[PDB]
Amino acid sequence: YIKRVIIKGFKTYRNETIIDNFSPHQNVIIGSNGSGKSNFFAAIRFVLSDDYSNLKREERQGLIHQGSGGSVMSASVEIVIRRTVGLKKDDYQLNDRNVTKGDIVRMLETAGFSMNNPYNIVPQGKIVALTNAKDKERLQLLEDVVGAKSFEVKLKASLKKMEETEQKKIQINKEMGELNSKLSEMEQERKELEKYNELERNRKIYQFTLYDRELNEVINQMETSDQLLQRLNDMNTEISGLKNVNKRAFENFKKFNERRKDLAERASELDESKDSIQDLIVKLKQQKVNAVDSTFQKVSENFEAVFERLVPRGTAKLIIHSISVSFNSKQNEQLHVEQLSGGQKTVCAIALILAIQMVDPASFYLFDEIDAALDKQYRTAVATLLKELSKNAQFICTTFRTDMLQVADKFFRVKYENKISTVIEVNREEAIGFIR
Amino acid sequence: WLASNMSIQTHIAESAKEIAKASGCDDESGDNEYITLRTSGELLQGIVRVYSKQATFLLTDIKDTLTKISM
Numbered sequence: 393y394i395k396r397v398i399i400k401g402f403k404t405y406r407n408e409t410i411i412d413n414f415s416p417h418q419n420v421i422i423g424s425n426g427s428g429k430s431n432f433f434a435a436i437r438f439v440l441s442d443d444y445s446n447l448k449r450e451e452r453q454g455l456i457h458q459g460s461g462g463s464v465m466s467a468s469v470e471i472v473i474r475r476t477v478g479l480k481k482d483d484y485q486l487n488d489r490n491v492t493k494g495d496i497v498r499m500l501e502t503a504g505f506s507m508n509n510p511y512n513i514v515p516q517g518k519i520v521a522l523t524n525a526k527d528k529e530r531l532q533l534l535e536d537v538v539g540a541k542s543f544e545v546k547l548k549a550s551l552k553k554m555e556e557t558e559q560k561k562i563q564i565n566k567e568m569g570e571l572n573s574k575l576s577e578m579e580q581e582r583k584e585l586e587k588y589n590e591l592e593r594n595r596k597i598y599q600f601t602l603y604d605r606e607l608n609e610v611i612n613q614m615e616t617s618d619q620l621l622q623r624l625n626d627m628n629t630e631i632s633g634l635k636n637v638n639k640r641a642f643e644n645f646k647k648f649n650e651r652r653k654d655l656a657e658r659a660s661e662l663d664e665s666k667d668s669i670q671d672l673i674v675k676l677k678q679q680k681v682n683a684v685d686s687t688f689q690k691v692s693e694n695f696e697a698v699f700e701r702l703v704p705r706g707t708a709k710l711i712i713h714s715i716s717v718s719f720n721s722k723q724n725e726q727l728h729v730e731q732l733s734g735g736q737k738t739v740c741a742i743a744l745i746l747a748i749q750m751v752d753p754a755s756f757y758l759f760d761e762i763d764a765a766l767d768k769q770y771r772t773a774v775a776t777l778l779k780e781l782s783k784n785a786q787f788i789c790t791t792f793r794t795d796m797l798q799v800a801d802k803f804f805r806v807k808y809e810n811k812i813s814t815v816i817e818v819n820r821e822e823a824i825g826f827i828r
Numbered sequence: 829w830l831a832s833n834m835s836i837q838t839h840i841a842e843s844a845k846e847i848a849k850a851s852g853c854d855d856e857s858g859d860n861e862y863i864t865l866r867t868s869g870e871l872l873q874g875i876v877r878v879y880s881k882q883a884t885f886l887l888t889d890i891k892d893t894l895t896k897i898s899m
């Protein structure tokens with residue numbers, strides 16, 4: 393359940409290649425050297441996967457087929473999904489209707505798999521290159537399935553702004569004291585208008601008791617009183633003595649204290665909430681291992697099983713530290729991989745990456761000439777195993793070893809007349825095509 | 829939900845353990861749609877993006893206040 397494919401103006405595919413069915417399983421492709429086979433799969437992930445996203449001029453031009461210029465503006469690709477491009481951000485002509493990039497960004501994840509499956513393809517002679525590939529690179533391989541370090545980049549990055557923020561926190565912190573201070577001043581300055589109104593009533597009643605207390609007696613001279621006498625100065629002596637008049641001290645202090653409280657609750661909050669993000673992290677930095685050291689299991693546990701297919705002659709295990717492959721090809725004597733035959737290594741490769749590919753199995757997979765250097769024994773073991781794997785997923789391979797053929801489902805050849813390259817579909821005489 | 833993602837204001841810690849739930853926090857692994865860990869990453873990011881933007885706003889305030897007193 394892939395659907396149709398045809399091109400217009402893409403790489404060596406000059407004009408039109410309306411030369412394609414076809415259905416699920418084991419579809420195989422070939423043709424001459426640099427006829428455009430690999431260009432063709434380029435065609436493929438071209439659309440399916442965001443490997444062709446941002447990069448500008450000489451990158452973006454390249455793709456369009458630069459064959460003496462011509463219509464440099466027209467480079468269209470059909471899968472079912474059309475993606476034309478012209479000179480300068482002439483984007484997706486998305487599935488007859490017409491949508492966006494960000495749109496099937498969502499759709500492939502809800503398919504899927506996505507952009508997200510990094511083993512969804514497999515060239516390059518890479519497989520090779522991975523013989524080459526050493527201990528640490530293996531770790532990577534694993535991580536990059538569970539996405540892991542794309543994660544790790546973020547972590548560190550957040551963790552910076554995190555402990556970057558937290559210097560504003562201190563700049564902040566300074567300002568609060570500086571506030572606390574401005575209310576420490578606005579405190580004394582209310583203590584007063586307190587103590588003050590205290591007096592000009594406290595006084596102003598003595599004033600009124602004695603207006604009576606001593607006119608009381610002149611009421612009666614018609615046929616604590618000393619204490620109060622000089623006490624009524626010990627008051628007047630101070631309102632006149634100490635008054636920086638301000639009628640607002642208990643208004644202006646009411647609000648401007650409230651805020652300080654409002655703030656120093658926010659201010660406080662932060663710390664609390666810091667200690668919780670900062671706590672969140674460790675909750676996750678754990679989860680990362682959980683995510684990995686779990687996949688690891690699944691991967692090893694696939695691997696042997698897979699390997700033991702290809703080479704039922706011996707067994708293979710994974711060890712980890714920071715990752716190794718322990719190995720023997722025939723039960724006889726074992727050990728580490730960095731000792732094996734060019735080819736001998738090359739087996740694992742595959743196995744491994746199958747082992748991996750198949751732990752988050754996607755709907756679809758392709759394989760540029762995955763068979764380019766392993767020799768005989770194995771080729772049989774592989775093509776078969778792959779075909780067995782075909783059942784559940786869509787597979788597409790290039791080859792030039794015929795050994796995937798004596799076993800294959802569909803069949804395609806690519807032809808290059810000097811400016812155009814074409815795919816043509818043949819069967820048995822296709823298998824004859826190579827043997828020539 | 830949604831509240832989380834793009835990464836104006838909300839509550840930090842109230843979410844830092846809404847994530848822990850998507851992991852193993854009170855020890856019942858594992859439910860929901862879990863942690864694409866891609867997701868975890870870009871979230872965490874966001875939280876802090878805001879956690880920061882808060883402390884900033886805060887400071888902006890204190891100051892805009894403190895000077896408003898000087899009046």
Ligand SMILES: Nc1ncnc2c1ncn2[C@@H]1O[C@H](COP(=O)(O)OP(=O)(O)OP(O)(O)=S)[C@@H](O)[C@H]1O
Nearest residue numbers: 403404425426427428429430431454455456457458
């Ligand atoms: N956009 C393009 N426009 C014009 N020519 C191109 C374009 N892209 C690639 N080519 C040419 O086509 C060749 C690439 O063809 P490929 O797909 O690599 O052949 P192939 O299928 O890889 O065959 P092998 O086995 O890898 S040699 C290059 O060497 C270029 O000369």
Ligand SMILES: [Mg+2]
Nearest residue numbers: 430516760761
């Ligand atoms: Mg190639």
